[PDB]
Design a binder for this molecule. Structure first.
Ligand code: ATP
Ligand code: MG
Length: 357
């Protein structure tokens, strides 16, 4: 009833009406895209998180929005955040924003790592849950493409949930190759080496590298490859990984990519134990297999789960897989934000009280 607002001060922190169902409100940070706040879900009498989304003005937010709604609505896993509610106007004409309701999670890996020091058992359990959730995503043929500590939510019992599927895509190996130094949108620091060389990021091994980066950050509380820019990122990787072999260079048919790599002075590998002196030797072995320069040699999710470091948790029949692979036609740098809006409206209909009143 609009008679519901929450200290805008900037962005869209003004109006924030979510009907009769969500009482007690409190802002939880925001952004120039949507505002976040906890609220009291009376029907369930529990506290949830509501994100205000205002995408119809920007077709890239509209595509990221529709995309995330369809996937998050199809997935059902303990380690992947889920949409519990979606609040919007009754008609397309009146729909300006959307409110996605999800479980309330106290913190995320990003903030935790900024203050806490994880124990090896905490590290193993967090890694276990990431891979468990990731095995489900990859089984549906979807790639997250933007995994990083801030995309991993934690509650007080150390339950982890993957969120943010705005950059997710269906796997496409046949259309992954591209030129050298191709623009990319995912977070620089967790970007696979092949992205700056000849990959579009349409492969599952792209996610494994990111999880590899996350493990290292957990082991030291510091990002392991913080390039300040595109190529700097790549030189951070080669500095620890050292110069790639011939066999690996032989896999780069891309001439511009290959010649740049050959133009570089030789660098020896820096052993992980010199980098993480108090790390569990098993964790470092796995860290090694994930942060493998060659995407074809990089370890698979299922393989990561069955690794000795995780034997305390590994249990195949307790690590579910998608019922049917995902798919959604439109995956293009374009689709009229006129068509998307009426598509978002339709995707969100199941949450309207038309089936209650
Ligand atoms: N279910 C939720 N639990 C608690 N707060 C939330 C919930 N929704 C995201 N978090 C936290 O609220 C914040 C803002 O919302 P969102 O996830 O869209 O952006 P973000 O994680 O801050 O950054 P980004 O712009 O990369 O998404 C982050 O601190 C995030 O970890
Ligand atoms: Mg996020």
């Amino acid at each position: 009833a609009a008679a519901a607002a929450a200290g805008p001060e900037m962005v869209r922190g003004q109006v924030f009406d979510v009907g009769p169902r969500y009482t007690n409100l409190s802002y939880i940070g925001e952004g120039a895209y949507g505002m976040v706040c906890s609220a009291y879900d009376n029907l369930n009498k529990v506290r949830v998180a509501i994100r205000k989304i205002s995408p119809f003005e920007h077709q890239t937010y509209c595509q990221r929005t529709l995309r995330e709604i369809k996937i998050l609505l199809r997935f059902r896993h303990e380690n992947i955040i889920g949409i519990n509610d979606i609040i919007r106007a009754p008609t397309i004409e009146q729909m300006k924003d959307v409110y996605i309701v999800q479980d309330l999670m106290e913190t995320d890996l990003y903030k935790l790592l900024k203050t806490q020091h994880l124990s090896n058992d905490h590290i193993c359990y967090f890694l276990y849950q990431i891979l468990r959730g990731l095995k489900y995503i990859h089984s549906a043929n979807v790639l997250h493409r933007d995994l990083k500590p801030s995309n991993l939510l934690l509650n007080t019992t150390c339950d982890l949930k993957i969120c943010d599927f705005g950059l997710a895509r269906v796997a496409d190996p046949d259309h992954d190759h591209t030129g050298f130094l191709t623009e990319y949108v995912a977070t620089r620091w967790y970007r696979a080496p092949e992205i700056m060389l000849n990959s579009k990021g349409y492969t599952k091994s792209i996610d494994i590298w990111s999880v590899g980066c996350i493990l290292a950050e957990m082991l030291s509380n510091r990002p392991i490859f913080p390039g300040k820019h595109y190529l700097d990122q790549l030189n951070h990787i080669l500095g620890i990984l050292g110069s790639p072999s011939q066999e690996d260079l032989n896999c780069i048919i891309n001439l511009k990519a290959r010649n740049y790599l050959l133009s570089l002075p030789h660098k020896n590998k820096v052993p992980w134990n010199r980098l993480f002196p108090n790390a569990d030797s098993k964790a470092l072995d796995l860290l090694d297999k994930m942060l493998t320069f060659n995407p074809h040699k990089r370890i698979e999710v299922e393989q990561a789960l069955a690794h000795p470091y995780l034997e305390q948790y590994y249990d195949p029949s307790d690590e579910p897989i998608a019922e049917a692979p995902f798919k959604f036609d439109m995956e293009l740098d374009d689709l009229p934000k006129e068509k998307l809006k009426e598509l978002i409206f339709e995707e969100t209909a199941r949450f309207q009280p038309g089936y209650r009143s």
